Structures are given as structure tokens and as C-alpha cells.
Write a protein that binds this ligand. Sequence first.
Ligand SMILES: [Mg+2]
Lengths: 109, 318, 293, 383, 45, 88, 275
Amino acid sequence: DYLVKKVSAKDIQELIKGERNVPLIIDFYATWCGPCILMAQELEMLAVEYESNALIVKVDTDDEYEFARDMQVRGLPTLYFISPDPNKDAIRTEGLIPIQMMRDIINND
Amino acid sequence: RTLQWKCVESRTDSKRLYYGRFILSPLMKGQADTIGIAMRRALLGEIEGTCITRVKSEKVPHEYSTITGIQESVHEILMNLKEIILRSNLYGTSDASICVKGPGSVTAQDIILPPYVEIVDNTQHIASLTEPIDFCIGLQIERNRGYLIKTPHNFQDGSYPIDAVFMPVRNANHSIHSYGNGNEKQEILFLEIWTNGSLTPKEALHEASRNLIDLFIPFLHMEEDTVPLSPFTFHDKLAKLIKNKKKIALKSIFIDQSELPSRIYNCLKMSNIYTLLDLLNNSQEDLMKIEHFRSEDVKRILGILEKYFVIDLAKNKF
Amino acid sequence: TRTLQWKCVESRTDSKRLYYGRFILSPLMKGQADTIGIAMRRALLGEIEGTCITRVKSEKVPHEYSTITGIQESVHEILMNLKEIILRSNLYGTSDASICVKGPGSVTAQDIILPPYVEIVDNTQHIASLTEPIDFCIGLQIERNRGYLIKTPHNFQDGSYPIDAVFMPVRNANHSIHSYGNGNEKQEILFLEIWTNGSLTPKEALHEASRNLIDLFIPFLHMEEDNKNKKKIALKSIFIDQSELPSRIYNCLKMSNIYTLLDLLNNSQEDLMKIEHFRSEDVKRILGILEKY
Amino acid sequence: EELDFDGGEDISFSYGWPPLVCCFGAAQHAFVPSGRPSNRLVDHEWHERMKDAIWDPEKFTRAPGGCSSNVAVALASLGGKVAFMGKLGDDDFGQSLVYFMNINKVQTRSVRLDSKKATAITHMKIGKRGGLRMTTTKPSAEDSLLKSEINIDVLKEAKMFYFNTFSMLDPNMRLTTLRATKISKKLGGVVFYDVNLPFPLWESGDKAKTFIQQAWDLADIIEVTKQELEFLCGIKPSERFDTKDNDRSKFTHYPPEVIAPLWHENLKVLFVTNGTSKIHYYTKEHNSAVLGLEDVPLTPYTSDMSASGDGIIAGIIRMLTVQPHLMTDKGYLERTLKYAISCGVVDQWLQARRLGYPPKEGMEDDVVPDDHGIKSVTEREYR
Amino acid sequence: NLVFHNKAINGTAMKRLISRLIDHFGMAYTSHILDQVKTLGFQQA
Amino acid sequence: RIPFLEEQVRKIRDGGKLLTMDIHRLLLNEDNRFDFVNEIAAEAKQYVENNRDEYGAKKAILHVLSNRMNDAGVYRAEAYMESDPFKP
Amino acid sequence: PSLSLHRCGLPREIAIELFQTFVIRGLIRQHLASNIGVAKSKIREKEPIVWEILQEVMQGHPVLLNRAPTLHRLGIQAFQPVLVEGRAICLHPLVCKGFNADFDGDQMAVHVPLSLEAQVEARLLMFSHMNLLSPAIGDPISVPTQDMLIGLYVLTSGNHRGICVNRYNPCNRTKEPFFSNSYDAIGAYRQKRINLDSPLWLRWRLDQRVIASRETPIEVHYESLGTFYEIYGHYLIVRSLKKQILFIYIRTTVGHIALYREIEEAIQGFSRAYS
Ligand SMILES: [Mg+2]
């Protein structure tokens, strides 16, 4: 019973095909990787500050190896800061980034 | 992979006494003495053990008074519980109890333990019972190193502390013999380990090696001069260094960022000058003693410093 | 948070041939500081590689093996000057060096022609001074060992004069312990002092010694890949006499210091054969008697 | 087909003895390319008894390595002279990264900072159906270094060039890194190709082979892993990957006949490393292998086994850049392999002791603004 | 500038040496010299 | 110039052997060693009568001796007090 | 053995019983105390602050130690107390030998001066470094004890020299290499390459203070070029033609040079710390 909930193959490609009023943070992680385990803690700390203004989900990279290559992922610790509106783009981050950058991306972009 | 070690002998004299012998033959001249002395000092005083720390009886006036039905006094019962050998791997405090009734002899098989702690001897003598009287005793187990002095007596009333000894290894010994290789001097190393049954001599050897490695590791860390155990210990530190205090922002600036030709850059690097503050500390006269330098590069560095910074600390004309 | 940190409190450069360093390891517990200090001192004094001059081929220069006409100093003096040269290198095996100087009055200093691997720390060292006009040619050999040169590779040399020079990169090391404890806790701080000859900084000596100690203690973790009378003394204390035996055999076993049945069981048939006047018929009869019960 | 700016010759003036090593690529923090199932030499008798105190992962997965910045920091810690050539942003993250490298003695003169582009931010487009993202909207600073920006002077001083296959993903950075490789090769120097196949290159073997065929020919020293070696060829893994005993089926030393196809003319040595457990080297005339420990305190945040590969590469480069004339010798290569194994084990120990254990079920420790971690003694509690 | 000794040093020799060092250097130097001699003697014994 | 001599110098400066040398040096200009004691006691009394709490660093006698040694060209600490910076 | 000549080891309970007045004054002076009862309760509570204040008080306060039998005139001396754990007063071995130490437990009375005059007199007159000569005739009362004399004798004794070191006559058929400095000799001894009794040749920097006896050299090898070697029983002088002492080598062991070096370095360190 945590904030960030697990997703699957088909249910994750539905919040982008529909509509929303809050940004969506798609997180790729693998159980094996060490760095990701850290990233999850700061993602939960960021989500506990935005309980209704932001949605944070996570998807593994071992059961969904097909949904990762077409997502254009290059490494385990990766995030996607997609926006509600259409037209505005997607932000892909690669690595262990501080929480200040995440706040400055979800607020000013 | 030329160095080979093997357990030469392995015996079990008693359930609380183990003996193992080892060999390290292809060793070199001066390495044997160091390895031997370090392993001896690590096997005696660096391995840790679990022992009973506090005992709580049902109703006794003092630890020196006797009790009906039991031959030994409370002091002898405490001394017998002191010799109980236990095995654990998790730090903290656990509770145990003995609740034997009836005539007979209370032994270690009568101690009930948490699922983490186990017993080794399972046949040690605690006390003797002669009358059908319930014997109910409380226990407290703790893992630590060395020997503990029962100085504190707070946080609990009606319990008698016992001075435990957390020393699994009884004795150790090493011997060094020559290999007979002619020109090159090679030596053979032996090791004898006596353990109290809580862990085999091989496990004690591995644990002593790991403890020595853990003691020698910190010399290879970064030299200390912000919260530890954090991967972002450099981001917030740099963010607050230039924001909290003055005259420290020059320390964060290095020569590399300041555009410079390769010659002046590598010459200043060979002169043990790495930061801008170090370049500001030495006057213009010091830049001449370094070899492979001229008078024009001094003008160049002064001009780019005036372009980057307002003035100089000690590089002014004097 | 209770993390073992190390700092360099004092650092001095007395000359190009001498250094100094003082270090501190604060949060050490009790009993660990002395062990760490002894181990680090042994590693600094014995487990650091050094480079020096082993052999000197002085047959090229004109000399009568006792004195040189051009060189003011004797051959012993120039050898003692060559053995004091400090070198910084990462050589594997052996390397050759040569020094040739031509001039009426010259002081041979830092004139060694070295490969890029080897470097000279102090260029002011004098090999020979007040040299008269002469062709001064010396062939040198350099090695890199930890302790010393126990045995030379070539026992017979034509004109090469071996120099018994110790490498010894670190000149001295010492440790001290300062106890800081209030109550039940007793913390100890280690104080390491290192003196290097200039070939390497005192800060690098700590890292080298620590890595050497770790490499020495790792092998203990290496793992290879895998592919009536029925009591105790009623039979044990049975001396051979009670079990009936022919006389010959009895006497023989006795001279062989075999009294009980355990001594007979421990001895095999081969060594039994070694016993004088012992025969195969006997070995079958003693086996039968031991089995006839 | 290359340009050189010689100018004044300052080679013998102030180059110093330790040859400069140019580590090319991106500057990231805690980024692992990929991960494949692997094995490890451990004592299962000691693990089955301390199962309540030792963190042993269920399925072991080792990453090929870390990043170019990590290798640079490791080589500078070993005592070598390193220099990182890459492009970063001018924001707080890029400046913090530069600081990290600098404080560790890596030379950042080559690094170039841009004010318009960020450090780790890439803009993407939704694209057509199927979730096919397009990265065209903006490149990151890392994958956008112009051919012009390459600092020629460093490549002239450097005697060994290091680059990974992570930079060769973007078409813009691929041409730049190939130009840098050929420039460093023509000016005089050896090229170290550390193939760390990222996630998109694990689809098929033929595509992965034809993708890195532009490389693998301009490099003299190549470091591959056992899984990547089996993936490039037609070798299929035939191990258990989950057993609790060493059966010698793993840690297999392939005969030289399997290495013949991928071999070329200017290749000198090939290192196939199964971690700090066993490292095999293949040369023209001989080949052998060196075993290792790979039994270290393994905690979460450190189970990917990346510092091990970083230290192995750092030690190999440190030993091969000092005596370049003995890259083919057998004994020197064995000493290099042993030193690299020791360095990898030491770096893994250091990373396990620096990044502590995650908090257990009962967590009351002070919350670090970016993570949460406890020491080893704190993780050894009852509940 | 102390005399170099190559023979055995008994108690009378140490007494004479201390009596001469007190007159040549003073009690301040002699105290530290005697402390160092004590340390070296304990170490050797 | 002995290279390995800084340890005992630090030991002299820390343990407090500087005062034993300073007293012997100051007793080299006075005839009677009793008038010197009386003069030091009088000066310490006069210095402690002016400011009670501000008698120096810790005491007044050490302060008087440090003042007498600093007026002769020998730099000495304030009342011979130098704490250990390596105390956790 | 670790204590200096002026410092003495004072037990904790004796120290607090002596400086109770001073520590109560220090508590009431600055803070953390409002009355005598609260200060006494804090001192009885065994808090770290009271021990810190006790150490700060006894940092530079002289204390007097006097044996119960005052037979000799030096039976009453002054020391500087150091806070030590235990129930026994720790003293210097030399002062203990000079105070007629016994095998039995010798009781020691501890007195603390109060007035400024008493403190000045104890610091300037009654210290041990000011009274080292006995008033009888002037002989040093502080001499090395039994163990120190044994150590010095083992150092300066040497080893065998004749039939006890060689079996056959040396007339039928080298020593340690010529050590340029005594530092190299001590380093080789610590590396366990030469024994403590193994003879060696130490290059002497022509100090001309050649200590020997009135004994002519055993041999003088006068060569044809003009440089003759004067071989003595303990040293070698290499002299050129025009009356020039080229080299001087001394044949000794590591103990003599160790003692000489330690005395010289003690003198030099004292002279440097004086400045
Ligand atoms: Mg008595």
C-alpha cells in the first residue's frame, strides 16, 4: 500500500491515448538495479508532496522488454515527464537526478 | 592463482571445542610474518559473540542467598549461566526463559530461544533440583565484542547482571617454515585455531580476514576536510558552498575552466597548482621559478584573470 | 555518521630527497588502533616497490680497477655515489642505462640517459666530480623489487660490479594512539607518520600499503571451482600374549615394539614384512588368529 | 581524411611521464546500461547459515559497467592521468558533475559547457501508434557534441583513447566519436573499445554485430563480457544461473576457434571478463585466464556490480598505458589481470561501504533530502 | 659533541656521564637526556 | 638537522616542558632564587588584584611568566595553554 | 614509565577529594550551579561536566607528594597531577628510586597548596628538575635504575671478538656494507637484515674526535701512488699523500650508534624546542 502503483503492458498505454488534467511520471525500473532503488525513494518523497497534482507510476523492464525498446530507453534509471495537453512534448531523463530538477521540471514545464 | 590454502586437520575434541589447521605454502619472504601477526590479532579480539547479559529470577532477596530445593546458590547459577555458549548473527537484545519443574537437573536443552539464536553444547549444567518446585528464570541475550562490565543497573528492577565474555576463539598459533627454493626466499605459513563451538575455524578465519579488510578499507576513501551515505553528497555541498560563506567560491573554480593554452595549463599542473585560489596565493615572482616559462604567459594569465575576476589577492604589483 | 574518515594534518617537504606526513583515523574503537598501526608500518617498510641501480659496468671508462686517472674519486666512492641515486619508475623486469660525458672539467650529475619509464627525482646528486679530460662511460642496470636483491641473475660477470643497494622507498614510519573516552565508550585515534625518500609522496604510500595489505589478505577468501569379554578394555587392552601365537611370531612382534592388538592393527602388512624373520606364512597365521575369535 | 593542428611542438617540454588518457563519452550519475543474468563464485555454506544477515539477491544480474566518468574517476584514484572529453550543460547538475570530476583530479579542460541545452533532459514526441517515441525534439548535451568542439590538443598529448558504445547510439554523436577515434589513432595512440551494449541493442545478434562494426576495427584493445561475447556470436547459454554449487560449466574458457571470426588485423588483445570471478585474455599467439574472488559485501544500491567493471577497466588501462611495449607479453598480462581484479574488488568494497543499506521495515532514521540509508550494523537488527 | 663510546657502560660510567652533563649542559638538558636514556634502556631490556 | 625529530618537539611543546626551561632561563639573571620568587608572587598578586576573573588564560603565575618570556624575544603561549585540536 | 619527570598520576577519587573546593568554585562561577547543595549533588552524580571542570582546574595546579618516612632530604617533592584511573598513584621510576622505593606498598601523602606564594614556591623551587644533585657531596641522585642499566649494558656491551666468533684462524681466508649514515644502519636493523651484535662499517664525517686508546695501528698499507690506509683496532683512516684525511670508517655495532644518535637528537630537539 504505497503511493506509486505498479502497471502492466496494456494499462500503461491508455493514459496517453485518453485525457488527463495532471502530469504523468512514467518510471522504468528493474529489481536488480541498485540505482533505481534509490530513485524510487525520492520519487515517493516527490509524490507525497503532490498528492493530487501529479501521478507517478512505475513499470519494470524485465517483464515488459518490448514496451521499453519502442519507448526509446537507454538505461535503467529513466523517467518520462509527459504532459496532459496534447502538442506539448515529453521529457526523458537518464540517470539519478536530484529532486530539485524534478520539481523544476514538473512546475516550470 | 599460485597461492593455495587448504584445511590440513579438522577435529572435534568436544561439542564446545573445535580445532583446525591450515597452510599457505607459496608465500613470500616478509609477507608471512605480517599475515601471521595480523591474523592472530584479529582472531583474538576482533570477532564477536553472543552471550547471556542479564538474568531475572522469580523472587530472591539477593544474589548471595540460597534457595530451597536447589543445591547451588543464586551466585553459582549465575556463574553456570555465564558459561552457556550461544550462536547468533543479529545485533540487539533478545529474551529467553527457563521454566523447568520437578526433580532433576536443568540443562541447556531447557532454554527456549527466539528463532534467531541457537545453542551449541545442549548439555551444560545450570543447576540441580531435588524437590518438585517450579524453577522459572528469565534471560537476556546480546551480541557484542570483548567483555562487558556490569556497571549499569537501570531500566530494570529485580534482575542481576552477569559479566559476559564475547570471545569465540580460545587460542591461536602460527608457524613459519622455509620452502627451499634456492635464490628466491619463499616461506610456508601454518595456522591453528581453537573455537568454542559457536563457529568453525574456517568461518573464524574468513571473518577475521573480512574484519582486517574492513579496517584497511577507509584509507582508500576520499580525504575528508554533507550527510554521509548519500549519493548526492556533492550536489548540495557545492550548491551551499558558494551560497553560505564568502571567499570560498574561488576554491570551486579550477584552472581548467579558465580558458588557457595547454602549455601554461600543464605547467601549472606540474607545479602543484590546481585551483584559482592557489594561483592567486602565489605572487608574480613565484611564476618565474618554474621551468619552461616565459614573461609573456604571465601577461596572458594576468589579462584573462582581469577579464574573469575583478582584482587579484596576492598577484598585484609589489 | 560514525564513518571512519582520514585526514592529513601535517605535510612538510624538507628537501627534494625527504618528505613528511601526519595522518589521523579518529573513530576507531578499542584495540584496533595498535593492530592497524603495526600492519600499516610493516606494509610501508616491506611492501612498497622501489627502483635503484643494481649493476654498474665501469669497464668502458678508463680505470685500473683501483683508481681512475680522470676521475678524482676512487671506484668505491663513485659506486657509493651511484647507490644513493633516487629513481621513480614502474619498470617490469630489468632495464639498461648509460651515461657518457665529454669535457675537460665537468661534474657528472643528472646525466643518466634513461627510458621514459624511469625518472630522476633529484638532479643535484653528484656521481663524480673534478673529472679530468677522459672518456667517461658507465653502463647501469635498474631493477624494481620490494625487499632487496637476494641473488643476482648472473653469477659470473666480466666487468660488471654489483652494488648491494637496498630499495627502501619509505625511510621511517611510526604510529601513536590517543585515547578519548568518557564513561563506558573508549575511542582511539591513530597517528601515522611517514618519511619518504622523495620517490613518492607520503599520501600515495598509504594507498599503496593499504592495497598491498588487501591483496595479501584476499587469498584467505579465494574459492576454487568445484567439479565374556566384550567391554572396551576387554579387547583393546588385550595384549598379544593372551591371543595364542607361535613362539617365533611372538618373539618377533615383541622386538618390533608391538604389544597390544591396537599396535598390530595400526601396523600394515608391508611394514610387518619389514620386521626381521617375519614371513608370509606368519602374516596369514596372524590374520587367521585375529579372525578365529 | 582528417585535420590536424600541430602548431608549436610542446611534446617534450611539460607532458610528464604518466601518459594522458582521454575518456570519451557522456557524464552521468548512477546510470547502468543494461543487465544480463550471470553467476558468481561464492561459498554457499557460509550463505546458508547467515541467510538472516547477508543480502543475497534471488536472481543475480550483473551490469557490464558504469559510465565514462566513473572509469575516469577510478583511473584518477589509482594514480593515473585522465582527461574527460564530453559536452555538458551549464545548469546546476552539469556544474556539480564537473565539480565531482575535478575534486577527484580528472582533467576537465576538454569538457565543454553549453548554455542553451540542459544536462540530462531529452525532448520526445508521441509519434504514431504503438507508443513509438521520437527523440528528435531535442538532443541532450551529452549526445550533442559538435565535430568542431573536439579538443585536438588533448588528443595529441593522450596516448590511449577510451570510448564506449553508448555514445554511438545517436547519429549525431556517432560521427563525432568516430572522428575523435580516427583522429586519436592517426596522431599516435591505442584505442580501448569497452563495448557495453545498451538496452536497445539486445534485440538480435546480427543487428548488434553490424551496428558496432564501424567500431571494433579502429580499436586495438577491446573489453567484452561473457554474455556479450555469447550474444555477438551464435553461442547460446547452457547454464543453470540459479544453482547453489559451482559445476565448472559456468566460467567456461572458450577455445580460440570461437574467437577467430571476430578477430581482425590491427587487433592486439581481447579481454572477456565474467566479472571479478574470472577474466580471460585472447592474443594472437597465446591465451589464458585468471581467477578472482567476487565475494564481497553486497548490499542494495550495489548489487548491480558496476564498480567492479569500472575498477577492472581502470586497472587494465593503468597497467597498459605505463608499459606499452609489453601489451603482448604473457606474464605482464597476467599481472595486469590480477591487479585489475584487485582494483575491482576494492572498488566494490568501497561502494558497498559508502552507499549503506536501505532502511528495514522499522525505519526511524533521519530522512536525507534525496534518499534514505543506514549503515551495516543498523541493518543487523531483530525487527 | 658527546664522546663516542665503544665499551661497556656500567652504573659508575652513567653516574660520571650525568655528573659531567650537568656541568656542561645544565639540569634542563640533563633531565630530557636522562628521560630519553631511560626510554631507550627500557626498550632494549 | 635530524629528520626524525618533530615528534619529541611536539611532545615537549604539549606536555609542558617549556615552563621547566623558562624557569631555568629566568633564574640565570638573578643572584638569589628567593627574591625572584618573592617578586613573581608580588607581581601575580598585583595582577590578580586588578581583575579577578581576567587573571589571564587560566592562572596568573603562568601569565606573569609568559609576559616575562615574551618581553625577552621568546614567543610563548598565553599562560602556557594550548588545547588539543584533535579531541573528539 | 610513560610519565615524565614532573607529571604524576593522580587517581580520580583522590583528585576529586582534593579539588572539591576548586571544582565547586568553578561550578558556582560560570554556570550550571546556583547553590552549594546543587553543586554537591552534581559532583556526587558523577557527570562528565564535573570531570571536565576538574581537569581544567588541575591542568596547571602544582601538587606536593611526601612519603610517610621522611628519612632523606628529597623526600618531599612537587609534581603536576594527571587524572588517571585506578587506586594507586603513578610516579616516575627515577623519582621512585630516588625516594627509597620498597617492595611493600609505600603510603604517599598528597598535599595541595592554596596561597599564591605557596604555588610560586612549589613551581620554582620544589620541582624535581631543579634538585638533581645530593647535598652530601654533589653526586647525581637521579641515576638510571636496574632495568635501564641492564639495557644500556646490553647496548654498549658488543659481542665476541676472537675465538668465540670464528672457529678457525682467519689467516687462511666480508663484513656488512659500508653504511653511509646511521639512519641506514638502524633501518637495516629494523628490517631484520643485520643482527644487533653484527659488526658493520659506518662512514664518519671526519669529525676528528676519534675515540680510541694509545695504540699504534696494526698495519699501514702504504701504496706506491701515495695514499696509505691506517688500519686500527676500531677504525680506518684513509690518508692521501699531502697530509689529507680522505675517509674515516668506524667499526661498531648498532647499539653504540643508536645511543649516540638518541642522545644527540635529544640535545638538538631540546635546543630547537627552546626557540
Ligand atoms: Mg616500604
